Amino acid sequence: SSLYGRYNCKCCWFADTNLITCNDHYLCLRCHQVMLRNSDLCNICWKPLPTT
Amino acid sequence: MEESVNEIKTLIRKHFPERQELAYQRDIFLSQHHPSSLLLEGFKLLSSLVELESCEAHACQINSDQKFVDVILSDHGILCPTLPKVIPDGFKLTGKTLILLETFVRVNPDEFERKWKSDMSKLLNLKSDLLRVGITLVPVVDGRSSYSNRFLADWVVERVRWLLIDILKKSKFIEEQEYQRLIHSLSNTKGLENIECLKKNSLGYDERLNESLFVGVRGDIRESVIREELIKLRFWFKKEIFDKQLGKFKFSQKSNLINDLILLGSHKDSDVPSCPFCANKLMDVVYSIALHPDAVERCYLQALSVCNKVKGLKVFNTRRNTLLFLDLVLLNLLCDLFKTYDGAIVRLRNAGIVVGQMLMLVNDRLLDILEAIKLIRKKLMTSPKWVQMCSRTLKNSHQDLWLQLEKLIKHPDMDNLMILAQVLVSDRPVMRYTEKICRHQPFSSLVEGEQKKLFRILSSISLALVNSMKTSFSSRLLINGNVRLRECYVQRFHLTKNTFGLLFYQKTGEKSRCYSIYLSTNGVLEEQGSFYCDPKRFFLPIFSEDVLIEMCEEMTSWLDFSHELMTMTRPILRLLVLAVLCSPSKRNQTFLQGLRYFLMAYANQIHHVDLMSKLRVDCMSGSEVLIQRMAVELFQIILSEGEDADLYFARRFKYLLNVSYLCHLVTKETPDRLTDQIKCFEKFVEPKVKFGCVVVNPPLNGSLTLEQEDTMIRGLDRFFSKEAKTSSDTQIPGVCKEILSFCISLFNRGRLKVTGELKSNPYRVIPKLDELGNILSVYDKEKLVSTCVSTMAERFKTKGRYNLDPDSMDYLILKNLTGLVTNQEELSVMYESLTEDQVRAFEGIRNDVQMTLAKMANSESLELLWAPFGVMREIKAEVSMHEVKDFDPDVFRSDVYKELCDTVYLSPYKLTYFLEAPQDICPLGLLLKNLTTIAYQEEEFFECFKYLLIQGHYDQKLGSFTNAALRNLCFYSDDSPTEFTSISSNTGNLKFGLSYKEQVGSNRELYVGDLNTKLMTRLVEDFSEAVGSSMRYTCLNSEKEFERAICDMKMAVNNGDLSCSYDHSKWGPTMSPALFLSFLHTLELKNPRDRTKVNLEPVMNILKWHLHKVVEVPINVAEAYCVGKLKGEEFFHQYLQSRDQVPSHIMSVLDMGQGILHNTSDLYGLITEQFLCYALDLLYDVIPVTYTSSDDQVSLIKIPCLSDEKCQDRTELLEMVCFHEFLSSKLNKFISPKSVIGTFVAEFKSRFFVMGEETPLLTKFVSAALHNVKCKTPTQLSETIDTICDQCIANGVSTHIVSKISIRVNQLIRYSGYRETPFGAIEEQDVKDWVDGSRGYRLQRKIEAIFSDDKETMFIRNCARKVFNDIKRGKIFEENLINLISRGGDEALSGFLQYAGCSEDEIRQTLDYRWVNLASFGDLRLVLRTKLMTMPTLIKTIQSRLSRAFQSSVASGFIGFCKSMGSKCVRDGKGGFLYIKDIFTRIIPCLCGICERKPKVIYCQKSLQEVNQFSKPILWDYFSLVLTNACELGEWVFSAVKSPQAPLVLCNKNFFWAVKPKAVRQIEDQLGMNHVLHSIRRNYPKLFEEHLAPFMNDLDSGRLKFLDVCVALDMMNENLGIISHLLKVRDNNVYIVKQSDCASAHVRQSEY
Ligand SMILES: [Mg+2]
Ligand SMILES: [Zn+2]
Ligand SMILES: [Zn+2]
């Protein structure tokens, strides 16, 4: 579709279930808490992670 | 007065009869008055004039009464039997050796060569049967382009060449059948289309040719028939092909893929051991060395330099007495230093000179003690003097200073030499030709230093491997399944403070050999191994031991998200990149490039069913099993991990894709030439034999027999007979006429997405074809032998008495081969530029020329004694291959005669068959006795046996109404088209020839054409390029819609459309010109202005010729098949079964030449693809769009609705895509198994777009930068590596890999004469100089980085700012500078500093920093490795701009470049070239202040007096660079440089974004022609400096602002190059960089 990008999350490509949104992109619920306790409140860059 | 006596009968009183006789043809020209005789006896007179000039130019007698070769040999007494009965123009016959010549004049470049080949092969057939008389024939043919004789000249344009055709065309009504031959011959014109003026006769073959092409193709069908047919076809397909699981595509699963991969490459069932080192013979040698297992030398290397300088100049008689004299010198020097010094052999001379019982020698060779002296006692006891008899030749025939001492003396002291031979007792090498003790530690346990050290040792070994071809290709040994190594070569490489390393071998040349690395640390030798390797495959890892480690570390750094994934994949990748380099093969390329198809099939959803049958390449040679295990085991550790497996899949995707692109580490070129020249003939003929439409040897002048017509018609009938409802799927080539007619019918009326709009009206040396890629052809060899015999057969006719033929004949040969640019120095630099195979070509020419000149002399069948003696084991049992087999005794074999069959035959008692003494300038009539004696004394025995068998007379086979077919003229142009059938053009049948092209997967074939068939192809390709250029969706020869396809495909992957990546298979051999005829026959293509039908009939008549074309069987495969099986391949089956003499010509319906009809098939694959878009839009809900590119396509199909769960109907896309594949089989387009369909990944021309951005290909661009070093000059390869490192930093590599490729190419120049230039190659230590910069800004940063204080280069930027502000703004303006630029530079720099206002205390202070040039008085004369027979700076490229095959290797290029940098290369004014060693040894060494900022690149003035003519400043070049870039980029270049504050910010390595090149704001606004008119108004008017291709007053305006100051700088300074830049657009402008390469880059403001 046209808003947003498809429905998959950018982290793992293969995931279209009850995921959550994020700044310009979606995130799955596994990848959210993984990337939350991986590094910080972000990536190494700033794509991800709005607060809960 | 009939206007025939006007200026014919009376102007013929005015000519010059200045040669052979008085009136001979003119007396029988005055007599006639009747014009039928007056013309026929007129052009015969003019042709007699042309042949009479052309014979005395070659100095032969005229063939007087048109007599044949049989009666012309039986004139003198040489009685010859029957013969092919040819008429020559002239003949010489100086006694058993005859020159035969023919002359002709053809104006056109097309019909020049088709007469030259014709009369050459009419003469060269005559040579093969002059054995019965034993005469050596030499043929010569001269064709010219005019009648420019010596007799009457040169207002011939008003003579008979113009008006005899006027007399013909006027008085045509007398009987003559008038021709376009006589107009086209006698006139002079200098070619495009509208071929319709030819006659078009037709035959009974052409009507059945048209009954098989244009029958069912109609294309006027209405649409609602076609829609019903397509719905019925879909019903049949879903019933009886799909739903029975007979489709070709299927879904993918994320477990069965990797569980069939590890049963594909991972060989479980092989006995190859598990560690990588034991599997490869070269990779444990690298492992064994990777653990550690000056006052005398200066007195030896200088003497060895003098020694091989003596070896360079020819001094003595034979090429063994040179080696014996030189080792006598070295052996006396060995005895000398043993007693003088104290630090003898035991302490200090074991630093490389002696290795234990063996010592160094002349051309990087070794020879042992006690066999050197046993060899030198051989002839010094037989020949009494041999020293004073031989040192006199060095006493008064060299330069006679000797550069030597009491070393070269008489009979050496053998007494202390035995003390030498008993101190040096024994350690002698093995070099073994020709298991389970795993003493190799596991690679994952080695500390990081030893892994990097395993890279270093491979660098050093590979450098010695490439240097092993530097040895001379004509030098041999003295003495000459493991062995024991008496003498050998050596290529020693250095490791540490005392350790060494040697590399023994035993042959010379450029192919694979037996090598044996030792390791001699402190004089103690040590075994390390032995291996075979092909040395020219090892060019990549030469100085690159930090490119590859930083590459592997970058790929590891992509996997940053988790440790114990990058501490686990780090040694697997290092060993992968190490084992790929340690064994290159085509099998490793063909494996590793096939894993991107696997990775896309794992990424997308749908894939072909024969995918896993194409990924498997079968194995050889043991190590390939381990490289396949490491490939397929690196995959299942990136993907397929535990619970957090596919966490960041984009990083894993680009990681495994760049692992798959490590097939570019292995070399792109061929492993062997004859196996690929076979493998590209059983890839040419295997589709045609299976299809069954092969005729062999057509009659080739046009017409055909009956059964060849019938085979052609049967192939046509099988082609157009596929049935629209059967199951002959993608295996069999053809086309059904129903679906093709549907495609044409919907194209004619406008319903497809491309119509017949048709803007822009669509009408708008002598190589032979059998032998492609060879070094020397047959025709070229007899050209060259004819050249040298006819040249040096009259040199000592007018200058001597046939008594003077020195080694200047080799100078004739070498200047004919290598051209030019004297007498044993440039003869040496010409002979040291021939590759080994063309060295053998040279030797085969020169012994032939010497044989002919030995036969040239005159001033028997009664005494033939014994050429071999008739008491040995043979008389003529196996040397009967001299009168039946192997026609001439020059190619008599010695293979089964191994090493001593021949030398037993070489013992007579030195009779008349040998000569008593070796000569040097031996007269003719006794050459072959000199040659057999100089081959006897040589210890080169089989050559001497062949010279005896030439001497013993063993070459014989025991000899002991008119104007109709008078093509007997010099200008009657029979090879010109007048009529044409459907197969012919009155000339021939459009010949072609085969070669290969050396890609990285598999070698694609390549067809070349004759000169007459290279313009017809050009007509058709230009027509279809025009017609396709009117269209909208093709992508082959455009760029606008290629960027538009990229911009659509990024969006289609980022939104979620089904993005299927297709690839068609066998596009070359399966297409056919019959398909393009039947397609184009019923198109419309309406004109732009008036909309009238284009007459497509000329392209029909050319495509019929393309249909009936002929090719040539290559002669190297036609000999390698008749050698084979001696009275197992699909081509070999159709080579043995033919009951003709031999097959040589192949004609068939198929094959559509590879690249020959390329744009036409782009049209076909465009229109039929749009038709399949229509069918899939009709039969489904989708809306497709394609981007075909003549071989492959991409199709971005979107699905309207149902993006929700519980689909049950949407997941059955399989019948759609299998039906697309079914119809594509129906048209002709077969889809290959490498074609993967789905979302998440799209690929088109290898671009690989992805959800996030795109995937950068690190490995492709780095491995393209590394082995693409082709070398002409250092500044040429310097800007070449600048453009490669430019286009590879556009694509996301880091700056560290770029800087290490820069360091590699700097150190790769410096392995030759060049010391260091301040311009260098390219910028080491760079950051931001690539986005807002060019070549000028990188050289500017390099020169500013030399002066690393920013106090001296400033005061040059301020001067540039003053002159630049005073050309544009205020109160001073400069308009008089061209006289200041051209006066040299030093005073010019002081003049441009005078404009700013400077003191004399500082205008000479900045004039002091200076650099040594080597291209000051011109350019370096270096002769490079190129093919046999292949003023200022910017003027040549502007002359190239105004005018709008066989391959070679890279390591041989670097060896030829390093050999042509130690010769007399540098130039010094008046000629008389010198060395680079001579110039750099005269520099005065001082610590003179200036030389302590960057030493031995920047010198002071007071240390360059002795060499002062090679000394320029850099502040002039720095001022020139700062001015000429600020012409064309920025005013910010005049500021300073400061740190960008470098804060503690987020240190991400993976936030690649894209940047636009900012601040490239020029001044000048669209140049291109406004400098050519500027290059006359302020330059001196050198518009007439070779005024080629004018735009003056036919094809000018000007006055652009800054070019007055900004072209003269390009004109005089050698290496700015700014007008090459500003006449071109940028190549990237899409730069993609990191986040910390823009927060850590130098900030140079405009005004700050
Ligand atoms: Mg493709
Ligand atoms: Zn996710
Ligand atoms: Zn081992």
Numbering used by the authors:
A (entry chain B): 31 to 82
B (entry chain A): 1 to 173, 179 to 195, 200 to 302, 320 to 460, 466 to 511, 520 to 803, 820 to 876, 884 to 921, ...
Sentences reproduced from the published study:
Junin virus (JUNV) causes Argentine hemorrhagic fever, a debilitating human disease of high mortality rates and a great risk to public health worldwide. The L protein plays crucial roles in the processes of replication and transcription during the life cycle of the virus. Z protein participates in several stages of the viral life cycle and plays essential roles in: (i) regulating the synthesis of vRNA by interacting with L protein, (ii) modulating viral assembly and budding by interacting with GP as well as RNPs and driving particle release at the plasma membrane, (iii) interacting with host cell proteins, and (iv) antagonizing interferon. Here we report the 3.54 Å cryo-EM structure of the JUNV L protein complexed with regulator Z protein.
However, we found that the C-terminal region (~400 amino acids, spanning residues 1818–2210) is missing in the electron density map, and a few gaps within the connecting loops can not be modeled due to ambiguity in the regions. For Z protein, only the middle region (AA 31–82) was identified and modeled in the observable density map, while N-terminal (AA 1–30) and C-terminal (AA 83–94) regions were not modeled due to the flexible nature and missing density. The Z protein, as an appendage of L protein, bound with the core-lobe domain of the PA-like region as well as the palm domain of the RdRp region on the opposite side of the endonuclease. One zinc finger (C41, C42, C58, C61) involving four cysteines is observed. JUNV L active site contains eight conserved motifs (motifs A–H), including six conserved polymerase motifs (A-F) and two specific motifs (G and H) found in segmented negative-stranded RNA virus (sNSV) polymerases. For instance, residue D1187 of motif A binds one Mg2+ ion, while motif B contains a conserved H1295. Our analysis showed that upon complex formation, L and Z proteins buried a total surface area of 2,150 Å2. Residue W43 of Z participates in hydrophobic interaction and is flanked by F688 and F1377 from L protein on either side, where W43 formed strong aromatic stacking with F1377 of L protein. L-F688A&F1377A and L-Y687A&F1377A have no observed binding affinity with L. Therefore we speculated that residues Y687, F688, and F1377 were important in the L–Z interaction, possibly in a synergistic manner, as indicated by the double mutations. The Z protein at high concentration in the cytosol environment would bind to the 680 loop at the product exit and block the latter, locking L in an inactive state.
